């Protein structure tokens, strides 16, 4: 419940401005560097926009993107993308004030647990995602 909080949830809440920069754990503050670098890397190529109105569209559209992202390969690089995208859908809900940011975070949380977390653990877990952030 904290390997997902420190790798995923924490960065989202920081992105949503729900939570300040030094509210993040030391671990979180290190890995945020690669996530930010990712976010700006992605912005440079594509502008993503959302039209979500309810909980229902969140579940299908999010699962659409993230499943397709891990249809073929899983790697820590695609994990950054998962986190970043999760944060940008969540920020849309923030800005739109439809009060569904918590749904996005829940949805991402559950997906990471049921589909990715067994692979993460199988591949060096928290420490490895840290190592990746430094490279």
């Amino acid at each position: 419940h904290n390997i997902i909080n420190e790798i995923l949830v924490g960065y989202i809440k920081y992105y949503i401005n729900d939570i300040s920069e030094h509210e993040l754990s030391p671990y979180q503050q290190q890995i945020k560097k690669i996530l930010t670098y990712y976010d700006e890397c992605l912005n440079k190529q594509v502008t993503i926009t959302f039209s979500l109105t309810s909980v229902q569209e969140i579940k299908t559209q999010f699962t659409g993107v993230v499943t397709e992202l891990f249809k073929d390969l899983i790697n820590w690089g695609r994990i950054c993308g998962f986190i970043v995208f999760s944060a940008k859908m969540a920020k849309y809900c923030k800005d739109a004030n439809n009060h569904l940011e918590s749904t996005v975070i829940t949805t991402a949380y559950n997906f990471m647990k049921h589909n990715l977390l067994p692979w993460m653990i199988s591949h060096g877990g928290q420490e490895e995602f840290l190592a990746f952030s430094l490279h």
Binding site: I34, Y38, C41, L42, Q45, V46, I48, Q61, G64, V65, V66, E68, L69, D72, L73, N75, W76, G77, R78, I79, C80, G81, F82, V84, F85, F132
Partner: protein, 32 residues
């Protein structure tokens, strides 16, 4: 096309992630 939109978003997330995950340098090498 809504599904296509979903697929392109996922195409960008994948390739940006993979270039990071692997050592993937740009193709163009300008040599003086």
């Amino acid at each position: 096309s809504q599904e296509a939109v979903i697929r392109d978003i996922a195409r960008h997330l994948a390739r940006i992630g993979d270039r990071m995950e692997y050592g993937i340098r740009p193709g163009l090498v300008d040599s003086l």
